[PDB]
Ligand binder design. Sequence first.
Ligand SMILES: CC(=O)O[C@H]1C(=O)[C@@]2(C)[C@H]([C@H](OC(=O)c3ccccc3)[C@]3(O)C[C@H](OC(=O)[C@H](O)[C@@H](NC(=O)c4ccccc4)c4ccccc4)C(C)=C1C3(C)C)[C@]1(OC(C)=O)CO[C@@H]1C[C@@H]2O
Ligand SMILES: Nc1nc2c(ncn2[C@@H]2O[C@H](COP(=O)(O)OP(=O)(O)OP(=O)(O)O)[C@@H](O)[C@H]2O)c(=O)[nH]1
Ligand SMILES: Nc1nc2c(ncn2[C@@H]2O[C@H](COP(=O)(O)OP(=O)(O)OP(=O)(O)O)[C@@H](O)[C@H]2O)c(=O)[nH]1
Ligand SMILES: Nc1nc2c(ncn2[C@@H]2O[C@H](COP(=O)(O)OP(=O)(O)O)[C@@H](O)[C@H]2O)c(=O)[nH]1
Ligand SMILES: Nc1ncnc2c1ncn2[C@@H]1O[C@H](COP(=O)(O)OP(=O)(O)O)[C@@H](O)[C@H]1O
Ligand SMILES: [Mg+2]
Ligand SMILES: [Mg+2]
Lengths: 451, 440, 354, 434
Amino acid sequence: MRECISIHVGQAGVQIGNACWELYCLEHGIQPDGQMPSDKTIGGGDDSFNTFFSETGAGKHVPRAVFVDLEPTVIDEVRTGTYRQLFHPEQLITGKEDAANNYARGHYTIGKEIIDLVLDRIRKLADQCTGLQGFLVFHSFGGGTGSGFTSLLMERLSVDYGKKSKLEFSIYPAPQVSTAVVEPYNSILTTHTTLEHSDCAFMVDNEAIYDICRRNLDIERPTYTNLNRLISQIVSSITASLRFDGALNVDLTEFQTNLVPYPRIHFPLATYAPVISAEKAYHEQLSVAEITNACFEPANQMVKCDPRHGKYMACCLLYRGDVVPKDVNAAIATIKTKRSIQFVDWCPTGFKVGINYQPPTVVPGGDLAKVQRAVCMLSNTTAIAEAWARLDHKFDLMYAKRAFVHWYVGEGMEEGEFSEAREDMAALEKDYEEVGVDSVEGEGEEEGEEY
Amino acid sequence: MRECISIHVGQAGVQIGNACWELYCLEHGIQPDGQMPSDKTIGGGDDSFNTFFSETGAGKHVPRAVFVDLEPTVIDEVRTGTYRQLFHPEQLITGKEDAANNYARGHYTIGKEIIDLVLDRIRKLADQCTGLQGFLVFHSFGGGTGSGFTSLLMERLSVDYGKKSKLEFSIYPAPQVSTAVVEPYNSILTTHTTLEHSDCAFMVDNEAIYDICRRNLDIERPTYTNLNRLISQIVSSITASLRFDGALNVDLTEFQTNLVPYPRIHFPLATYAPVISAEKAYHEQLSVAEITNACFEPANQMVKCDPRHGKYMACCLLYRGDVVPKDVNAAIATIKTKRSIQFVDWCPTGFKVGINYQPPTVVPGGDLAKVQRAVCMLSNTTAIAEAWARLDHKFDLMYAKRAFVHWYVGEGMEEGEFSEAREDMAALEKDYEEVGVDSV
Amino acid sequence: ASVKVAVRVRPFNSREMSRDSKCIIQMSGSTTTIVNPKQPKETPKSFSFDYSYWSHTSPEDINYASQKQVYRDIGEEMLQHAFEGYNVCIFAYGQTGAGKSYTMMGKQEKDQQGIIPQLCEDLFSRINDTTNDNMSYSVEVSYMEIYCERVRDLLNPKNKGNLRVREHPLLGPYVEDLSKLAVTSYNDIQDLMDSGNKARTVAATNMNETSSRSHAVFNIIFTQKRHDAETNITTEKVSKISLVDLAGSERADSTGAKGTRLKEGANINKSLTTLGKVISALAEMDSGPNKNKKKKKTDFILYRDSVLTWLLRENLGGNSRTAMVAALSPADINYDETLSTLRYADRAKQIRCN
Amino acid sequence: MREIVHIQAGQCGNQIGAKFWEVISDEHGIDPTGSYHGDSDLQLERINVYYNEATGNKYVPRAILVDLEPGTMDSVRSGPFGQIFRPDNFVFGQSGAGNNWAKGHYTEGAELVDSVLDVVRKESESCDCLQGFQLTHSLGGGTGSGMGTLLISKIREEYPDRIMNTFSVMPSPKVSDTVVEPYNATLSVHQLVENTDETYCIDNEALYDICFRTLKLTTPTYGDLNHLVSATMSGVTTCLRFPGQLNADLRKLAVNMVPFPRLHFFMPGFAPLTSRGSQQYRALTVPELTQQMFDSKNMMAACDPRHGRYLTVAAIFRGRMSMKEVDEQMLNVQNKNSSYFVEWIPNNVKTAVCDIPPRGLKMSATFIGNSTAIQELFKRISEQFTAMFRRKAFLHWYTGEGMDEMEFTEAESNMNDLVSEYQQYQDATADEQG
Ligand SMILES: CC(=O)O[C@H]1C(=O)[C@@]2(C)[C@H]([C@H](OC(=O)c3ccccc3)[C@]3(O)C[C@H](OC(=O)[C@H](O)[C@@H](NC(=O)c4ccccc4)c4ccccc4)C(C)=C1C3(C)C)[C@]1(OC(C)=O)CO[C@@H]1C[C@@H]2O
Ligand SMILES: Nc1nc2c(ncn2[C@@H]2O[C@H](COP(=O)(O)OP(=O)(O)OP(=O)(O)O)[C@@H](O)[C@H]2O)c(=O)[nH]1
Ligand SMILES: Nc1nc2c(ncn2[C@@H]2O[C@H](COP(=O)(O)OP(=O)(O)OP(=O)(O)O)[C@@H](O)[C@H]2O)c(=O)[nH]1
Ligand SMILES: Nc1nc2c(ncn2[C@@H]2O[C@H](COP(=O)(O)OP(=O)(O)O)[C@@H](O)[C@H]2O)c(=O)[nH]1
Ligand SMILES: Nc1ncnc2c1ncn2[C@@H]1O[C@H](COP(=O)(O)OP(=O)(O)O)[C@@H](O)[C@H]1O
Ligand SMILES: [Mg+2]
Ligand SMILES: [Mg+2]
């Protein structure tokens, strides 16, 4: 069966999980207490789809998830809030000190002990599964647990399972805004784990989502709930092809197969087109061409890098709702006509297309308008290099003077490892700059004669 | 007695047989169920003549025929149609694949097995016969079964029986029109069987009959039923002398004796004069001279060859109806007067004449007008060479590049056999060009 | 631009000589003629060829095409071309029992040795004769067969489990896991030919009890390298010698069976048709450029229609030298088989009877 | 009796099969439950070509459904005609190839190939005289292309004598969904050239252009494309089920179309198509039928035959019509279009006529062209393939499944040789100067 396991690590992961599981419960008709009234109303169907929920004897539906954190505050907020009866009591909390915004504590000293419990719970959930497709890991670069413990967990998962997919929905640090001082060290030290082990990593930036909320939804003072709601919409759009039928359904394996040319360059950008307020929902048609055009605007990207500075290596569009292949094909043709969007010459086709009949849902108390059509775009492009390069600069400005290094060194981490990360980091950028080069020299060719 | 066996082979053969047996059933007063009401009305005579029908104890008349095909469609259509109760259930069908417009399949691979059943039924019918005169074989060049299985069947028949006559009423490919791509291969590969084995072979072309129907019988959109009806009329005219009395009755033996000067040039042309619509049946006399003149017109020939380009080696006229020898002789004299008709210098007489009293009949729902007089001409002439020559050209255009050859070679036929056929074909043409030369 | 055609008529064997047999084939110049024995009055069928070889009885001291004679005409030229670095190929065509195998192998008594033994003896002579310190000669011999478009090795004692055939873009067609063995004398090659011809795929039919159900190709890989006291070291001299034994043609008249027998016959006949078309097409462009020197495009000669021509591409196309010899039976009974063999040989630079 | 076994692979194959079986069931008067409720007696005369009999006077299609994602099988089963197929013929697995031709040819498809061949054998031994098979699959996909080629190979090894046709949907230059279409198309055309007697080529833009331009439909979906393809498939095998004045089994078309074994790729077409609202203005006669049939814009493969020469064509008509008119119109279209037909076939128009037209029409016709212009379909693909291979765009996904670059190069060379083959038959006429 099309089964997934969602691992939430860190405060950002836990809050993203809150928003995500709110959306899934609303999508599938599950009440906060786990019971589905619609089972006895319809009397058939698997609307409590196995992709995210496991059904027990009494009709209760337990989500397939594992929260993790090294601070009891946030997970206890989950454990006392509205959804306290939904989740299994195994929330895997370390009732001890935090990683304290230190990669070393989350990876080497404090990250131990809890790792065994986390792996045991993941093993149990995998055993309960039959046809596991992959893991979804939510975390945040720049945090303590979200960086180090996520790296350790990914290493152990890659060792244990090997072939199963592992996607990442991670929060990269922003160019200007930042809520920590030692953020670049933590962000850089995860390059090895997010490069070697993860199969496909999606980057989201809080500044980009703030800009989207300010411009599109017309919210002057957003908070993290809106950001988590948008990210949850994107995850639901990605995973919808597994759950609901459609004219063209894209499994995770197809999505990866079409998005990643080479095994080191798996960093696509996620965007959602019909992000519009209810008041502005009127005066608009929101046809297929409109949402496809909106997907390509640099203003609506979720990470602060302009694709116009780079080349579109690959694209995957996932439509939901009242959509027909004709308009999708026409929109793709119109996109290919424009010369502002550049494509590498070693990818003549350029696109992947999926269509799902189930339209998106509106969370009560949210801000997104009810719509009949939507699309989620995953674009693998070279412009992501920009988002890396800026952060690299900051790292140098700290590592030249060895600022804050003693905190990492005292916690059982060798100093030279710092430099190693940068080397890996640098190599990755070079790799991206290699795949933008528009064709080989092809110096060898011959001439012709006449007879 | 004057007894004949009619073998129908292929789809064209089966449909020609349908039309032919409709005609004879109407001629002799046989109902579709085999019974004759007139037997108890007249109380005498052999109106269910033995030339085509065998009479059982209960008064039923079973035709002397054997249909054959390698596809159950057409013979099943026969077996369910109006005349299902007429024929014996032995229709000799191979419930397997068709010959697929491929000579090799019809002769070598698929043609076997069914050959034994066909020969057994033919032997049974021959044993039931007393005074068998010859076999009539209907088929078509260019088809799969009609070419290969016909060749195999005639080889075995010539082996088993030998001295009995064997006539062809075969459909030759047209110059321009054609319903197949590999037609010339199949048509050329049968030159050996239609040359060595057959005693006399009549050639008919669909283009010529289409021209006749669109011009004489004022029909613009004809179908194969009209063609089969015309061919049936010709066969009936040929075979009438065996069944009905006449002032001069021309058996098959004397007809052959007069039409074939040498044993290799037995390819006459068949024509029928009073082909006219009932609306045009008025305003016309249709005397003996008129029909005799109309038979010689190149427009009314049934294969696209102009006799004016060649020489008339021999002619055999068979009249039906209110005809008297005085007008026949006068018409023959008038024909001999004209210089547009050339006769070879070594055939001073030139004509065979037969006269029969029974007039032709009109099929209900047909298109030929009722008439008091008619004539069928069988003219052996050199112009038939033209009809061969065109075909040879087409064959060359395929065989220079070995187009479609693998289909034949893969089915157990040696490639070089192709060339052999053309050599025989070429020799045949040369023979005709030899006999058109004036003596010295 | 070198395709020649050869024909060789066999003499009456012991059974034919003892029985009341008759001869129907005549020779003169380049023209071979055959007459139908039951109807010779019609016309003699004649064909012209580049090479022709006569034989009707055993001794035939004077004006006779001995094995050494056919070797000099065909074999010696091909061996010289192989020595000069050009790929070479010799086909032996004919019906079963026609005597083509006699030409290819010959008698082991060493009184009349076939083309293959004489060729290999001269090769071993040339190499040992021209063997010096700098020139390095190396020879490796392989032997293979095609049965129903499937390749089988004959020299290796392993199981006869059907193998695949592939093509390197630079190195041309090849076969996966085909054993090749080095040889240094006539004894080794003779042992290899015995071990090979003992393992051929044959079946009993109504024509001959050991009629070949498979084509057989004996390949010799010959290389000559120069390694002097210097740095500009190249080879520039590599050749392959192909010796092809073809299964005789057959008709459905003789192959009175369905299924495996008819399938094998049809596959075999398709292989001969492909080979004949390949050689005729090559011969047309042999005639053309040799006198025009006009480059009428590549005119690619199809070799995929069948596998036999595909693996022989390196020895068929390019600057290769190919010839074929057809075995003809002059006995009275084999008129139809013989005439079919003449027709098959007529192509590949067909020459008119002047 | 000639009886056909039908095989379907992938989403495209399954959907075309569903629509085609609906069309045939309505043609033969079969209810969705399998019971017969027709009027004419000819419908049961040769229903056994496609159907088998079951005891309670029930008819079961002789179809075999293949896939690796259960979603399509569930969609087919829970439908208007889902109950008609026998459940044992539904063959599927899990975790499909996902547009990876290696997975559906080596890793995954090897698991289900044995089960599918067992079902095929059971279907074939129940057939008293098998005529040939029939495969419907998408060429640019995953499980479809790969497992279809594997099944073709295994069936050709098992049943060499029987005919094998293929209604394949091949990639588009413009209407392209999957990014790795060229790899799958190349590695499949490597196999189609060797192990099939016929191969009807279909393109999505041709069907869309037919829908927008002729049928004047405003919102064509995959249902309409499946409708057109099903109409063509019904037209091809019409003569094996109904009587006529000239019959044409699948073999006669195979004999009369392909001149050489490799040139067995066809361009299908169907007529009439008149927009459902303009049929009142145009009369249904054989001249109009054949004029629409030979029109360049009607072809279902997105190739202009005016860029090449017709090696052969076959026209199969349905309905009561005069043979003379058909022959005259074929002569007319051959003579007027003198430059679009090769000369080394003097007459290269095969003709067949069937008495029973479609249910709601007076007369119709279907067309199978064999032209050199089809080479374009490969050349474009080859171009894209090179553009994605010389840099190794997505190569690792294949090589992790147990392949190597040599197979890619072999497939590319095979397709190029096919293209050159077809190219040699569009210029070489007859001469000595060249
Ligand atoms: C005169 C009349 O009654 O109306 C026609 C009609 O108006 C037209 C426009 C029909 C109509 O077809 C369409 O509108 C159409 C739309 C998309 C794709 C294909 C067709 C018709 O729907 C289609 C329908 O066709 C059939 O029933 C044929 O037998 C056809 N059947 C099916 O395709 C079929 C569909 C669903 C369920 C079962 C069968 C067929 C064709 C070939 C071989 C076998 C069967 C007919 C008669 C008509 C309508 C109803 C309007 C046409 O269809 C055919 C193939 O006959 C479209 O152009 C033709 C010509 C017709 O004039
Ligand atoms: N978009 C979004 N970002 C969040 C959210 N919660 C925390 N973050 C980000 O997380 C980063 C801070 O690091 P954390 O993820 O909280 O680290 P941690 O999981 O608490 O682990 P410790 O550092 O040991 O406390 C900042 O960049 C925040 O912007 C959230 O709900 N939504
Ligand atoms: N005059 C006339 N010709 C016909 C008739 N039916 C078919 N033909 C011709 O027959 C030729 C085709 O050969 P067929 O007789 O159909 O071959 P077959 O007997 O069906 O055997 P297969 O090739 O295996 O199908 C065409 O040239 C047709 O014109 C008919 O009723 N009357
Ligand atoms: N004609 C037609 N083509 C289709 C249909 N569904 C998908 N396709 C085409 O098939 C291709 C995808 O192949 P797919 O069906 O996924 O192959 P599979 O993975 O083996 O099932 C796309 O390029 C579509 O254009 C259909 O219903 N009809
Ligand atoms: N000078 C010669 N020319 C041609 N054939 C000859 C000559 N001397 C002997 N032969 C024949 O060579 C034949 C060899 O046949 P063989 O190799 O047994 O055929 P197969 O291998 O097909 O069984 C013998 O039948 C023999 O009569
Ligand atoms: Mg916490
Ligand atoms: Mg039939």
